[PDB]
Every structure is written in structure tokens, then in C-alpha cells.
Amino acid sequence: GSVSKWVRLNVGGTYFLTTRQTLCRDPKSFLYRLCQADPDLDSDKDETGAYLIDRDPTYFGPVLNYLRHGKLVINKDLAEEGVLEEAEFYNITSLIKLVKDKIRERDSKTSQVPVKHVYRVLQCQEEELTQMVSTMSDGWKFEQLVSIGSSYNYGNEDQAEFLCVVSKELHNTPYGTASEPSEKAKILQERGSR
Template identity: 85%
Template sequence: MAELQLDPAMAGLGVGGGSGVGDGSGPGRGPPSPRPAGPTPRGHSRPLAAIAQPLEPGPGPPERAGVGGAARWVRLNVGGTYFVTTRQTLGREPKSFLCRLCCQEDPELDSDKDETGAYLIDRDPTYFGPILNYLRHGKLIITKELAEEGVLEEAEFYNIASLVRLVKERIRDNENRTSQGPVKHVYRVLQCQEEELTQMVSTMSDGWKFEQLISIGSSYNYGNEDQAEFLCVVSRELIILPTALYRNRAKRQR
């Protein structure tokens, strides 16, 4: 006997009394439900179209870190040479030209920019290095190739007050050192025994420095102990004043 199999897609119509299909006892017959276009898998009560629903879009890839950090960096075109630094570095001196130009964007300091977006500054790039390094770490570093007066000129232009004071102090110290004339040393050689060495070094007069200790290499018996002897070399600076400066000081003392 042949067995009748119902299409699962027709399950929604019901079998026996629910839909009235085939017995004429129910309400009026309606048109049959449309069958899905594709094949219906066995063992499922829903069509394949209901199963294969489109997936909702998930979260996109994470944004690159540091994308917004580009605004922290500043590009400067000083006399045709490019310098790159941060706004935090230029903001160390709030009243300086660089802080007002790049950090505060003072309208009174309207500076043009080149095709790369760098601020155009018509100054000597050779002396800008010490200026920028001072803003970075707070130390004044001047190479032998640079003149201190040139650094002072740039510090005054950029209105960095603390750097101006520091450069002026260094220039003044160098002038005083030059005016004192060449520095020479006076040496003294002291002979002492081993037990006297520590006391002699610790009680040296001001200005004298220990230079060298020389062992004589001979010893003699003093009582029951051997006493070694040493030569202790000490020195101090002797400043020779130029003749003109010496005469001026002599006149003042009179």
C-alpha cells in the first residue's frame, strides 16, 4: 500500500479539520500557499529562505592608535631648514615668540606656511638648534663652532627670558676668565712619613690640591716598626694679571 507523504512546506495549512482542505467542512477554500523557490530540507518545519537570513553587520576594524596625535607635532621652516617638535616643547615659555605662534596662534604673529604646512621663520637655522634644545631639556649647549653672542641674539628675538639671562651669565663668566690672564700652577714637594701622610693631606691650606704621591723606596727602623717615607706633590693656581689690569687694580687700592 502506497504511503502518502506531505510536503513540510504545506504544514502551515494543517491536516484534518484545521484548514478544511479536502473535506469541504471548513470555511471557503483559499488559494494554496506559495511554495518556496528552492528545495526544502527534510526534518525542518520552516522553509530554507527563513533559515538563511542575512547577517547583521558587525563592528568594523579598530581605529589606528595615535591618529589624533598628529596635532601635537609642529613643523618649522627656519631659514630653509626643517625642524620638527611638539607643541608641549614650544609651550615651555608661554611668552615666547614660538609659543604665541604655534600654540596660542596669536593673530598678531601672522606667519605664512610653506607647501608642507610648516611655519616660515626668517632666521638663521644654525643658531636655532641651541634654542630648541633649551626648550626641550632646559640646558644650554653651545658647540665650539657657535658664538655665544649669536645664541644671545636669537634668544632675544624669540623672547625666551630665562635663556637670555643664562647666555648673558656665561658671556660674563668668560670675559672675567679672560681678563684674569693665563692660569699657571705652583708646585710644592713635601716629604713625610707614612703615619703623617693622612694628617698632612687633610690639613692642607685652602687652594692647595694633592697631585701625586711618590714612595722614596727606603725605610728605616724607628723603634720596633718600619717607617716608610713618601714625597707628596701639591699644587695651587697662580693667576698672572696682565700689566694694564695690574696697574688699574694698584691705582684703585691707593
């Protein structure tokens, strides 16, 4: 009444009751400016005094959740884009900093169509080959085995007898290649390369 501790609010014609501090959590939200009692913003119901906000109640929910606990949680049906622009209306940088990251994650995962598989050439004896394949590290997929004509021990019973090419899926598009300048790293790279 005389003071507003838990304010009832109208977001797209829906009742939302929450304490001011949940909304006053950060100093950038448009809702923060709403919390401030001044004649400039006077728009509320004549029944209960809930402020009339012409924004989406469904996309307002994740924003209120973030303001309550600094984490934006979006249900598995609401587009992250819609909440993105809803927050843009509510003008919260740090939150937006996370919505854009989530969107980039989604776009990179969808851009994993040309996924970057990391390929390795393990080499094993025919004898050790059975265990090697059986013991082949979890997370890596077998791709090809190739026998070769060896010169030592005839063309068999050789360490180079079998070349078991394997690979592993890497979501590099979300990950991003980890390339950066390290002077001694560059020196080592050039020395090994030649």
C-alpha cells in the same frame, strides 16, 4: 592637520619638526606666541605649512634644546653671542639669564690674564723640608725656598731654617672675591688685625 601636535617649522629655510609643548615649555618665548593659532600670525609654506621664520637655524638649535630640556647647549663652534641675540629675538628671560652668565664666565676667564695667585709661606726644618716639598699639597706650585741665619741650633737644624713660599692659581675673575659684611666677622677681623 585639523590639530597641530607636532608642528613643522621653517627657521631660515630649514625644516624643524617638534611638538608644541616643547615650544610651549615657557610662556615668554616668541615661539610661544607662534604656537597660538590666531589670524594675526599666518606665515607658513604652501607645500607643508611649515611656519616661515627669518631667524638663524644654527642658533635656533640651542634654543630648541633649552625649550626641550630647559638647558641651553651650544656647540663648540657657534658663538655664544650669536645665540644670545637669537634668543633675545625669541625673548626668553630665564634662558637669557643663563646666556649672560655663560658670557660673563667666558669674559672672566679671558680676563684671568692677571690671575690672582694665593701665596703662602710654609716654614719647615731642613730635615722635614724634603718631605714637606715632596708632600706639598697637590694643586699648589712651589715658588721659592729661602734659608735664614738662625740663632737657635746655630744657623741650621731650625724650624725657621727654611721658608718655602708656595702659591696656587685661583680663577678669581670668574669666582669673584667672597667679601660680605658679617658683624662678628668684622669684630674678629679688627681684633686680630691689631
